[PDB]
């Protein structure tokens, strides 16, 4: 199966405007193979990802995950971003947490403008049980069972400097992909858009 | 060359079936002092596309427990449904 | 070989919505390439391909379709389109034409303004006679002009003159010319060309006798 | 036979919206015409295997 | 900017012949294949005439065939159109039309001004304008009526262009061999019966000059 | 085993484009750009020659 | 003689437009060394290339011709061209030819944008004779001497494509030059210039 899950595929859509203070937060993501949002109109359907059609048939997984942003900005914008992962669960309280704060947590920086276009990041495995469940298939909570190692911010490090005749906005792709996956414990079930 | 042409750039071989044993195992740090070549990429180019990321140190995870590995086909299909 | 069709033949649009025009054929044709005729000159460069819009149209037009249906997709209607549009196909020899589709920009209703007048003398001396009825700055296109000929309505002489839309207050103006002769002019008194309006309940009377001045 | 063949255009707008399909065209169907060259040789015969060069 | 610039054209009567010319420049003509179009005032369009860079290949629709003939000059880089046997379908006006490639047809790109081709058989006509008199508000309408003429272009301008922006040209209707327009021109209250209102007629066919000046009835 | 011409099953391949990101300009920058498609075989091998046209 | 004739001089000029669309042909070449078209006019003369002035004094010639296109662009225009070679003589109908139909022919293609600005065009010899006559001396067409071995046809393959604080053209010089070349029985001719 491994011929599927290491392979990146789209799984989100986020814009960074030229309008933004440093420090405001554009995006969060929590930390799961069970993670996409996108969707079609024509025809109808809900779009998914490789690596969510491959751990959405198991009662366990682990391993670290790689997520890949791709940029698209013209040659002559300018700016830095800030990548922030806290290590916990699915459900935290996160948007609390300053732009000097998230320095204490892993990060790393981008420069948009260059020659390369992609930055490959990968999460380490941070948990206090061997395996983490899957709980879509229930509907009721319960502390100590979860579906997340942690949650990710994505800053603004930078603001966004830029000519009169250019656009104001650079359109980044969030991809997905898998190293070291591990899973078991077959069952059924299709998933569902995660609408953050 | 079979067809006589002639080529520099090169689109190289795409999704290599069954790369990888899918049970957690061993074949000391996996990542660490040396700066990370493969934190920063682009993702246009399909030579540069499979080389291993690394951006934190890490090191070795462990072997699991379970002796058979659930992510091949022959066994997860093996059940009848 | 075979021949075009268009669907609509004139379409109305305010200014802010959604136009949608279809072109058709009954042999199915690969690419369709359109052409915009404006009001005294010729058509340009509108549509190459199937959907590729010239060097000098805006963003907002389109085009899309394959084998028998074909649309020119139109988001926002705006100020700039007081044209004639026209489907061309271009399969084997033929090269065949659309019908053509008269895209008007509708503006909000107004009341007909009327002012006729009669015959001049040297018309009058030259053996026959025009009674040329008038109206100005009216919505819709589509009126309803009748004669009021001492009491009765006579059908035979209509000659009636129709501009297209002015480019400034977006208005329509009209001619009613009703052609008689010398002897016949001098057989009634009552004139009166009356311009039945939909919103405007009864049409309005604008009246003159003959035997005045 | 092997040689490039311009077979089909088409024409990317600021109009398109996002996941829009700009071209969908049958790549060995395009290339059985009398305008190419290879038409010389697959018309009188009936069988062939192949592979596809894209550009 | 390509340059397209017509010539020619009239009355003809029917079973006559006429040559046309379009006589282009600024661009190589040995890269262009050339055509022409018909604009019936009824019924829009019809194309009829093809010739390719020599002058070998000619190809006409069912209706043309042996009717028309073309020819490129590529030495004075102009163009022809020899029309033969005329008959009232063809009173229409005539663009030179270039073609181009697309990737499986072709494709127009620049039409000239065109000329003005009319087929039927009375004489040539000069016009008879008389004027348009009231029998009272801050707008009073004025006009002038032409009537009377049978070559289709005149030309009804308000003292030489001073009132244009306030102009309503109704068009022509052709009533018995013979077209009828009427200009209608809007005058302020002061201005009429005050200053001089007149109406220019220029009739290029006969070389005909009439002005009528409106008086008060 | 083969492709046949002049009867065929369902086609082989089917090339598709799609847009990734939308288009973006600003004042007077030209609203379009053009495209092409080049193709062309490789390891051409023909049976069974036919006389019917 | 070769000192003269294996440098190249300018030839031809064209320009390429911005408001072209696909497939539109832009330039037609008969393929021979008497080839030339540039003028000035204080003072005034019909100006000549180098090959044509070695060529023009020989009954026969034979052998590669060598095209020098050379573009002067900036370095914000984008666009591709297409340069196809028809074989045949100087009088064939080629502009039935469709965008389509000219990659049967031998073709080439060339991107503007870059760090070199000049492609040369190396022409096959392509006959059914061994020499290929002069005729200019004569006045009379006849069917089998001829004085080329086919045309060439510029194409426009992609749209120029701009901003706005650039110009809406790119000019082309076209160079010519010779090698391998052969000539022999001599005479006198003074060339007039070929108005294509």
């Known amino acids: 199966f491994t011929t599927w899950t290491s392979i990146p595929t789209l799984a989100a859509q986020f814009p960074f405007n030229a309008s933004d203070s440093v420090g405001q937060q554009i995006k969060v993501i929590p930390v799961d193979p069970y993670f996409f949002q996108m969707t079609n109109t024509n025809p109808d359907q809900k779009c998914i990802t490789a690596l969510a059609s491959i751990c959405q048939m198991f009662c366990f997984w682990r391993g670290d995950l790689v997520f890949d942003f791709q940029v698209f900005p013209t040659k002559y914008h300018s700016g830095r971003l800030l990548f922030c992962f806290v290590p916990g669960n699915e459900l935290i309280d996160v948007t609390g947490i300053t732009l000097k704060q998230a320095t204490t947590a892993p990060c790393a920086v981008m420069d948009i403008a260059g020659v390369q276009s992609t930055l490959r990041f990968r999460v380490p495995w941070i948990s206090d049980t061997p395996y983490r469940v899957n709980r879509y298939t229930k509907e009721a909570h319960q502390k100590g069972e979860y579906t997340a190692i942690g949650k990710l911010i994505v800053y603004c490090y930078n603001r966004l400097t830029s000519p009169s005749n250019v656009a104001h906005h650079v359109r980044v792709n969030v991809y997905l992909s898998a190293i070291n996956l591990e899973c078991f414990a077959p069952l059924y079930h299709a998933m569902d858009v995660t609408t953050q | 060359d079979d067809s006589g042409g002639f080529s520099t750039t090169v689109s190289t071989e795409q999704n290599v079936p069954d790369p990888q044993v899918g049970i957690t195992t061993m074949r000391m740090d996996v990542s660490g002092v040396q700066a990370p070549v493969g934190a920063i990429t682009t993702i246009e180019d399909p030579v540069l596309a499979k080389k291993v990321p690394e951006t934190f140190p890490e090191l070795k995870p462990g072997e699991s427990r379970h002796t058979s590995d659930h992510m091949s086909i022959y066994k997860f299909m093996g059940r009848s449904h | 070989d075979i021949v075009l069709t268009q669907s609509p033949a004139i379409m109305s649009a305010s200014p802010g919505e959604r136009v949608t025009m279809t072109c058709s054929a009954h042999v199915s044709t690969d690419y369709m390439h359109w052409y915009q005729q404006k009001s005294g000159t010729s058509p340009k460069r509108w549509i190459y391909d199937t959907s590729k819009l010239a060097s000098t149209v805006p963003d907002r037009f389109s085009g899309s379709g394959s084998g028998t249906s074909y649309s020119l997709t139109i988001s926002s209607m705006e100020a700039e389109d007081a044209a004639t549009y026209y489907c061309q196909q271009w399969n084997n020899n033929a090269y065949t034409y659309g019908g053509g589709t008269k895209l008007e920009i509708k503006r909000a209703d107004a009341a007909p303004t009327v002012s006729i007048f009669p015959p001049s003398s040297e018309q009058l001396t030259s053996g026959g006679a025009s009674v040329v009825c008038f109206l100005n700055n009216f919505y819709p296109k589509d009126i309803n002009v009748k004669w009021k000929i001492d009491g009765s309505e006579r059908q035979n002489g209509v000659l009636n003159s129709w501009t297209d839309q002015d480019s400034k207050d977006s208005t329509y103006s009209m001619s009613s010319t009703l052609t008689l002769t010398k002897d016949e002019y001098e057989r009634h008194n009552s004139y009166t060309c009356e311009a039945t309006h939909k919103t405007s309940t009864s049409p309005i009377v604008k009246s003159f006798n003959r035997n005045e001045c | 036979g092997e040689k490039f063949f311009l077979i089909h255009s088409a024409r990317w707008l600021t109009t398109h919206a996002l996941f829009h399909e700009v071209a969908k065209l049958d790549v060995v169907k395009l290339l059985y015409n009398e305008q190419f060259a290879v038409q010389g040789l697959l018309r009188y015969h009936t069988y062939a295997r192949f592979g596809i060069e894209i550009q | 900017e390509v340059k397209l610039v017509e010539s020619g054209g009239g009355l003809v009567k029917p079973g006559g012949s006429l040559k046309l010319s379009c006589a282009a420049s600024?661009?190589?003509?040995?890269?262009?294949?050339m055509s022409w179009v018909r604009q019936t005032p009824e019924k829009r369009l019809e194309w009829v005439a093809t010739?390719?860079?020599?002058?070998?290949?000619?190809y006409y629709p069912d209706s043309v065939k042996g009717r028309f003939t073309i020819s490129r000059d590529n030495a004075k880089n102009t163009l022809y159109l020899q029309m033969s046997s005329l008959r009232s379908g063809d009173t229409a006006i005539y663009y030179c039309?270039?073609?181009?490639?697309?990737?499986?047809?072709?494709?127009?790109?620049?039409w000239g001004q065109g000329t003005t081709l009319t087929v039927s058989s009375p004489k040539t006509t000069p016009p008879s304008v008389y004027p348009l008199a009231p029998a009272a508000a801050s707008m009073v309408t004025l006009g002038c009526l032409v009537k009377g003429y049978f070559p289709e272009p005149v030309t009804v301008t308000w003292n030489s262009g001073s009132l244009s922006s306030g102009v309503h040209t109704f068009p022509a209707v052709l009533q018995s061999d013979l077209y009828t327009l009427s200009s209608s021109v809007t005058v302020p209250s002061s201005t009429w019966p005050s200053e001089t209102v007149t109406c220019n007629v220029a009739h290029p066919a006969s070389s005909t000059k009439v002005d009528k000046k409106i008086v008060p009835r | 085993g083969a492709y046949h011409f002049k009867d065929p099953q369902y086609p082989v391949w089917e090339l598709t484009i799609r847009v990734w990101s939308e288009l973006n300009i600003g004042t007077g920058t030209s609203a379009y750009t053009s495209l092409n498609v080049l193709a062309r075989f490789t390891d051409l091998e023909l049976h069974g020659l036919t006389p019917l046209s | 003689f070769t000192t003269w004739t294996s440098i190249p001089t300018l030839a031809a000029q064209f320009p390429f437009n911005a408001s072209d669309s696909v497939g539109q042909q832009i330039k037609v070449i008969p393929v021979d060394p008497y080839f030339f078209q540039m003028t000035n006019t204080n003072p005034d003369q019909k100006c000549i290339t180098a090959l044509a002035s070695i060529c023009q004094m020989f009954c026969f010639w034979r052998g590669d011709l060598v095209f020098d296109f050379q573009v002067f662009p900036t370095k914000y225009h984008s666009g591709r061209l297409l340069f196809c070679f028809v074989p045949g003589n100087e009088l064939i109908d080629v502009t039935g030819i469709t965008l389509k139909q000219a990659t049967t022919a031998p073709c080439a293609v060339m991107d503007i944008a870059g760090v070199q600005s000049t492609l040369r065009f190396r022409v096959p010899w392509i006959s059914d004779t061994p020499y290929r006559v002069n005729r200019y001396t004569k006045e009379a067409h006849q069917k089998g001497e001829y004085t080329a071995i086919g045309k060439l046809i510029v194409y426009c393959y992609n749209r120029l494509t701009s901003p706005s604080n650039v110009a809406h053209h790119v000019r082309v010089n076209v160079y010519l030059s010779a090698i391998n070349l052969e000539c022999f029985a001599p005479l006198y001719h003074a060339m007039d210039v070929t108005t294509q």
């Open positions: 600024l661009f190589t003509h040995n890269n262009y294949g």
């Open positions: 010739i390719n860079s020599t002058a070998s290949y000619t």
């Open positions: 039309a270039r073609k181009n490639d697309t990737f499986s047809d072709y494709y127009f790109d620049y």
